[PDB]
Amino acid sequence: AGFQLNEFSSSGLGRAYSGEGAIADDAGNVSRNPALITMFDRPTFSAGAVYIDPDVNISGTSPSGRSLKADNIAPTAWVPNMHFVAPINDQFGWGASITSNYGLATEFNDTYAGGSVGGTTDLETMNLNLSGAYRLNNAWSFGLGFNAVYARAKIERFAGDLGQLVAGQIMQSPAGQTQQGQALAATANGIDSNTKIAHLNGNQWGFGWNAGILYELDKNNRYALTYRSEVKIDFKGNYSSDLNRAFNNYGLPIPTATGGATQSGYLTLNLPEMWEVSGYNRVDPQWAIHYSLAYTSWSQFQQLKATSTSGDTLFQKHEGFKDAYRIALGTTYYYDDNWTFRTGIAFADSPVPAQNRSISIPDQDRFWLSAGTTYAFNKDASVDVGVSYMHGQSVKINEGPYQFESEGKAWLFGTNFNYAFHHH
Ligand SMILES: CCCCCCCCOCCOCCOCCOCCO
Ligand SMILES: CCCCCCCCOCCOCCOCCOCCO
């Protein structure tokens, strides 16, 4: 699912985030649906983190003869979460949380033959949320939330074997016999595969809002609709390329060379909005069933475009994402006053059309299998441990002169501590 994260709590991880937004056994879920606030009787707190260990691989051969093989190109990630919820009165409450809905990390050796389209790609995101909720009656609740998103990003690309390729082209050509042609071949051969062809970095705050509706049949069965708005991050940061000025203005398909000098740069990143419907059903004093369909408007993310203080394009990449859905189903076994158990599955289709796949964000349809458990120390305190495994199909990728194959899987492990305070 592109660069979206769902890892906002360890219990959620055990459910495979199914019907999140209709469950309120810990404070974690208010981030997902502000209306769940009305479900809380006293100040409740939750803090933990999810460890994501991807194993994503690339295979292929460049036209140069060099291998396009790259193993383990998605570094492990630690995603923290922190949550708080508290009543105001019989019909009002509020919450705050620190989560992450968007994140991405890909890394190739700066010597990689295909380095002009896989160097380093890093996006980390933090969502500061502040919600309030109104209890209309025993059935209807409403939530309204505001989000301050802090985002830190970095892009780096290298000349892989392009220097070699270009030199070959010249030398095979009639210009191979010319002084002019030879000098260019020399220059091309001279571009090391670790020559930095593009650098971007910046951090910026962005802002958005979210809303949610909660409907309860009884104390054991509810349903929810939630909306999370788009958030536009307007980066202003640094752009650089180690290539000589002399490369620019011939219309070659490359980022603007700056001879290593840094230029101020502007790029707008769109974090897509998301809708979600959720259902929770406590079938039995020990058994619950939960499920959700979520819809993310990835079409809101069309490209990476970077711009000088003069309006010139310094670096551009077409993304052309399409809207995508995530669906999930899970169960919870409330064994005894101490132990709770859970498992779930989810599926998410890639928002990246095959013809726009790229190796920096090698995405495919995914499945999650998860299981988790909660131990309750004492009605006031509990720890949540969750495990999830994700599997993705292998997919074909075409960028520039290169053809790749990609496969990805991952293990997720997470722990959360929960505390509940003195009632009213
Ligand atoms: C699939 C990637 C999504 C997230 C990418 C950025 C998220 C930040 O992860 C960085 C991973 O680095 C590990 C964190 O460092 C260890 C922190 O643990 C210290 C405990 O206090
Ligand atoms: C300069 C105008 C910007 C238009 C394109 C921006 C996006 C470019 O990214 C394409 C990535 O290709 C990088 C390859 O650069 C060439 C390195 O080797 C050239 C030496 O022969």
Mutate to test the pocket of ligand 1, among 3, 4, 78, 271 (most ligand atoms within 8 A of CB): 78
Q: Is the CB of 103 within 6 Å of ligand 1?
A: yes
Burial zone of 355 (CB within 10 Å; 0-12 exposed, 13-18 middle, 19+ buried): exposed
Q: Is the CB of 254 within 6 Å of ligand 2?
A: yes
Tokens of 32: 């997902």
Note whether 31 and 8 are within 8 A (CB): yes
Q: Which sequence spans correspond to the domains of the chain?
A: 1-424
Q: Is the CB of 385 within 6 Å of ligand 1?
A: no
Q: Is the CB of 151 within 6 Å of ligand 2?
A: no
- Atom nearest to 314 CA in ligand 2: 3
Residue with tokens 């380095």, as numbered in its chain: 115
Q: From the CA of 119, which ligand is nearest?
A: 2
- Atom nearest to 256 CA in ligand 2: 1
Q: From the CA of 54, which ligand is nearest?
A: 1
Rounded to 5 degrees, φ, ψ at 286 are -130, -10
Residue type present at position 260: G
The residue whose CA is least distant from atom 9 of ligand 1 is 77
Note whether 415 and 383 are within 8 A (CB): yes
Angstrom distance (rounded) from CA 68 to CA 372: 38
- Resolution for the entry shown, Å: 2.7
Q: Is the CB of 79 within 6 Å of ligand 1?
A: yes
CA of 354 from ligand 2 middle (Å) equals: 22
The DSSP 8-state label assigned to residue 233 in this structure reads E
Tokens of 417: 């501590």
The DSSP 8-state label assigned to residue 169 in this structure reads H
> Which architecture does CATH list for 1-424?
Beta Barrel (2.40)
Residue type present at position 263: Q
CA of 197 from ligand 2 middle (Å) equals: 7
Q: CA geometry: angle at 323 spanning 316 and 14, to 5°? A: 110
What is the number of other CB atoms lying within 10 angstroms of the CB of residue 52?
Answer: 23
What is the number of other CB atoms lying within 10 angstroms of the CB of residue 283?
Answer: 11
Say which residues have a Cβ less than 8 Å from residue 8's Cβ, sequence separation at least 6: 17, 20, 28, 31, 32, 81, 97, 99, 100, 101
CA of 252 from ligand 2 middle (Å) equals: 7
Q: Is the CB of 405 within 6 Å of ligand 1?
A: no
CA of 74 from ligand 1 middle (Å) equals: 12
Q: What is the DSSP string of 39-80?
A: G-SS-EEEEEEEEEEEEEEEE-B-TTS-B--B---S--EEEE
- Atom nearest to 257 CA in ligand 2: 1
- Atom nearest to 52 CA in ligand 1: 1
Angstrom distance (rounded) from CA 255 to CA 316: 7
